[PDB]
Design a protein around this ligand. Structure first.
Ligand SMILES: *[C@@H]1O[C@H](CO)[C@@H](O[C@@H]2O[C@H](CO)[C@@H](O[C@@H]3O[C@H](CO)[C@@H](O)[C@H](O[C@@H]4O[C@H](CO)[C@@H](O)[C@H](O)[C@@H]4O)[C@@H]3O)[C@H](O)[C@H]2NC(C)=O)[C@H](O)[C@H]1NC(C)=O
Ligand SMILES: *[C@@H]1O[C@H](CO)[C@@H](O[C@@H]2O[C@H](CO)[C@@H](O[C@H]3O[C@H](CO)[C@@H](O)[C@H](O)[C@@H]3O)[C@H](O)[C@H]2NC(C)=O)[C@H](O)[C@H]1NC(C)=O
Ligand SMILES: *[C@@H]1O[C@H](CO)[C@@H](O[C@@H]2O[C@H](CO)[C@@H](O)[C@H](O)[C@H]2NC(C)=O)[C@H](O)[C@H]1NC(C)=O
Ligand SMILES: *[C@@H]1O[C@H](CO)[C@@H](O[C@@H]2O[C@H](CO)[C@@H](O)[C@H](O)[C@H]2NC(C)=O)[C@H](O)[C@H]1NC(C)=O
Ligand code: RET
Ligand code: RET
Ligand code: HTG
Ligand code: HTG
Ligand code: HTG
Ligand code: HTG
Ligand code: PLM
Ligand code: PLM
Ligand code: HG
Ligand code: HG
Ligand code: HG
Ligand code: HG
Ligand code: HG
Ligand code: HG
Ligand code: ZN
Ligand code: ZN
Ligand code: ZN
Ligand code: ZN
Ligand code: ZN
Ligand code: ZN
Ligand code: ZN
Lengths: 348, 348
């Protein structure tokens, strides 16, 4: 056999030399050099050191500024929370696991590890579909007098947690399951064994269709809509109204956010599908370790794209950070927002 | 003319089309795509969000743990402090600048950007010499009963600041000057023009001989000394006394720190020197942007070598992160201490 299937695992290493051992009971240094695990450990550490501040700061700014209440300001507040669950929820276990060369906390740690990374990526994926819509409803404007209230935003946010949970929670209760992958310091869904006892083969198809092919289609198709309408071609102050102009920005961003997602997940999803379609074949520990760990940057790139592609949030952040105010920068030239300064309601 | 010189700059772009404008008065988007500036801006944001907690935490642990006071401990607090300046003193302007496409704070921002990036890198090169020495004084011990006390440590620290300032400061008071480079989002020493009005050519030979070629000779030399004595080969607990084997671990860190530094500056120093001996030739903005923005990682790679290459520091840091105690792991094995917990001195 090319690997070593266990009742709880599947190490991508032959046990012909009987050197293989349950990744819930002993270091896996026979899969790779111990320094490479240190790498993972070092890496997971820097990610937690970056992901905590960036996602907490994002969260703190959003809340403190009473006007940052657009559908977009919601979705990204959502992403910051889900990213903080990633950091504290599973990243803590993945660094702890890399530090020991195996899942000391056994399957429980593997579930934390798997669940939160899943929950996080999936909340990002579904938040993209909500943006695709909101983006569409404003650009191709289907109604003749409609506008997304905060309520809607809270609806979209509630929707992403039902969809993400619909995909992330099943494996904890008998449908499919989380299993260690690559150097066995991370955990994902089961694409490795057909384990009929927990119905793995069906869940994997349920996840690649309901939580992937489909949301991607929506998102992609919706883009093909905002092709003839709002284009990437974004000029200066006013495009047909400084309003419309600044509309071209959110969409440009919502489009970058999509490219960042794919880059981050296509490789993982790709190897994952392969393995599903080539179970038991001869792949090694490094095969899935690279995309599996690279994809964890998903807990941080969102806020970065946000602060670099949103003059208003960046300013609100600079204002926040600068303790007092003085948003120096160039401001947004347009609306502003905060707590006691110029959060002065200015509708109609 | 291949580039466009101003009395204040030098844009590595021809003004044949008349599209060039002061990197002090308007965006340089005609030098490169606007997304590429957003790219540089994302890079710096991360550098600021990682370099801050990592150099601050370093600083805080050292000060907090009463035993971390060896020369090494002294040099790296320094670095942690020189790194916090780069980040706040300069990286902040380099982010804001990329966020706008040019130096909005004119030459003052340029000075901020360049001075600190210079102050920071030079302190690093000088501290590398102080280590080369302390290293040779312990491995080739030219003395009889001489010990490198904390006093010799505060000396070698002050010394690095005298050298670093000797280079970082002149350009601010009339000898040479800081000028934007590459996409004009970073500032450096004037390798571009002769501007006799400020003696550029001289300062540049001063900096490549005193603050580069010399220290590297020393460091490389002392490395030759400890070639026959302590080398890379370091066995388990002891090699002629665990004291003699625990030092061979500080030496390898010092070597790695030197490698890390070279990988960070030779490319820059090289481009920088290439341009000084070929001023006016045909190079573009990308030419110096890469090695220039790549070197800014100097504000964070040091603390990482240290955590990864110094058990003592490592274990004593996690003790700080576990709020209270909870040494877990396998303690420092040798000394351990902190602010009060295991701070108990057990010397002679
Ligand atoms: C590359 O070649 C270009 C074409 O030959 C050449 O173009 C000249 O560019 C200058 C500025 O870069 C132009 O002069 C400006 O004209 C505007 C009027 O529209 C003025 O407002 C501006 O000065 C102002 O001064 C105020 C007081 O200090 C200040 O508040 C303002 O902000 C602003 O500084 C300039 O007088 C000039 O018209 C252009 N001539 C041509 C032929 O178009 C570029 O300068 C040249 N670029 C290089 C060499 O870097
Ligand atoms: C790869 O082949 C190895 C040899 O067949 C095999 O080693 C076996 O590992 C098990 C661990 O479960 C040992 O079983 C021990 O189980 C408990 C330990 O708490 C106790 O009842 C006994 O100590 C018992 O020995 C086997 O003894 C051991 N057999 C050997 C060394 O020949 C690996 O498990 C195989 N890799 C896999 C499938 O994980
Ligand atoms: C072990 O792995 C090898 C290589 O991945 C498998 O061999 C392949 O077998 C399939 C048929 O299932 C062929 O289409 C390929 O051409 C084979 N490739 C090679 C390298 O021979 C093998 O099937 C695996 N063994 C099992 C079933 O555990
Ligand atoms: C503009 O840039 C070109 C490219 O470097 C310069 O041309 C070089 O000139 C040197 C000395 O005159 C020759 O040895 C090289 O062979 C030339 N490079 C080539 C092959 O083009 C040119 O001198 C520069 N012009 C200015 C403003 O000085
Ligand atoms: C380190 C953590 C890892 C590798 C997380 C595992 C996450 C999953 C099994 C998630 C699956 C998918 C997505 C989040 C995005 C779309 C594609 C999937 C179905 C492969
Ligand atoms: C982004 C910041 C930059 C490009 C910093 C500029 C720094 C200098 C002018 C520093 C010069 C040098 C060193 C610190 C190391 C040795 C080689 C030099 C002389 C090129
Ligand atoms: C960006 C999507 C990534 C898609 C994943 C590609 C799986 S590709 C697969 O990898 C195996 C490694 O053991 C090779 O042995 C095999 O020949 C190759 O076809
Ligand atoms: C961290 C992700 C940000 C870097 C990726 C570049 C995306 S794109 C970039 O965005 C700028 C800000 O709105 C625009 O002004 C510019 O025209 C556009 O090309
Ligand atoms: C260690 C990195 C040192 C890099 C120094 C080599 C510079 S190389 C130099 O670059 C010019 C501008 O791009 C070209 O026009 C020229 O043909 C090329 O030889
Ligand atoms: C929480 C901060 C993360 C920094 C990682 C510190 C790894 S520390 C490492 O751990 C091993 C087993 O646990 C011990 O045997 C060893 O002595 C200790 O130095
Ligand atoms: C089209 C691209 C959008 C991409 C954006 C950038 C946001 C990036 C952050 C990635 C996390 C990098 C972490 C370093 C840890 C070593
Ligand atoms: C969009 C930008 C991607 C940017 C990425 C990464 C920048 C950060 C990491 C610095 C850690 C370097 C490690 C030192 C190893 C010695
Ligand atoms: Hg869309
Ligand atoms: Hg990513
Ligand atoms: Hg604002
Ligand atoms: Hg040395
Ligand atoms: Hg470096
Ligand atoms: Hg300690
Ligand atoms: Zn079973
Ligand atoms: Zn889902
Ligand atoms: Zn199957
Ligand atoms: Zn601004
Ligand atoms: Zn002048
Ligand atoms: Zn110096
Ligand atoms: Zn010259």
């Amino acid at each position: 056999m090319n690997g070593t299937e266990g009742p709880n695992f599947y190490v991508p290493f032959s046990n012909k030399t009987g050197v293989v051992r349950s990744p819930f009971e002993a270091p896996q240094y026979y899969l790779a050099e111990p320094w490479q695990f240190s790498m993972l450990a070092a890496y997971m550490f820097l990610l937690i050191m970056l992901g905590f501040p960036i996602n907490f700061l994002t969260l703190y700014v959003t809340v403190q500024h009473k006007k940052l209440r657009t559908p977009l300001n919601y979705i990204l507040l959502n992403l910051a929370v889900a990213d903080l669950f990633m950091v504290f929820g599973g990243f803590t276990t993945t660094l702890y696991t890399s530090l020991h060369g195996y899942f000391v906390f056994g399957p429980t740690g593997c579930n934390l590890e798997g669940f939160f990374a899943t929950l996080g990526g999936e909340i990002a994926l579904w938040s993209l579909v909500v943006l695709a819509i909101e983006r569409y409803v404003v650009v191709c404007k289907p109604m003749s007098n409609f506008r997304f209230g905060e309520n809607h935003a809270i609806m979209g946010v509630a929707f992403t947690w039902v969809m993400a949970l619909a995909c992330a929670a099943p494996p904890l209760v008998g449908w499919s399951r989380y299993i260690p992958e690559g150097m066995q310091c991370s955990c994902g869904i089961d694409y490795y064994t057909p384990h009929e006892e927990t119905n793995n083969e069906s869940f994997v198809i349920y996840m690649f269709v309901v939580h992937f092919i489909i949301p991607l289609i929506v998102i992609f198709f919706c883009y093909g809509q905002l092709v003839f309408t709002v284009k990437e071609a974004a000029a200066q102050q006013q495009e047909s109204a400084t309003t419309q102009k600044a509309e071209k920005e959110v969409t440009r961003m919502v489009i970058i956010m999509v490219i960042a997602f794919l880059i981050c997940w296509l490789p993982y999803a790709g190897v994952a599908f392969y393995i599903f379609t080539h179970q038991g074949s001869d792949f090694g520990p490094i095969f899935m370790t690279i995309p599996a760990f690279f994809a964890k940057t998903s807990a941080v790139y969102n806020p970065v794209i946000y602060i670099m592609m949103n003059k208003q949030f960046r300013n609100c952040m600079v204002t926040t950070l600068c303790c007092g105010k003085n948003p120096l920068g160039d401001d947004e030239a347009s609306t502003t927002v905060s707590k006691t300064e110029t959060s002065q309601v200015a509708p109609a």
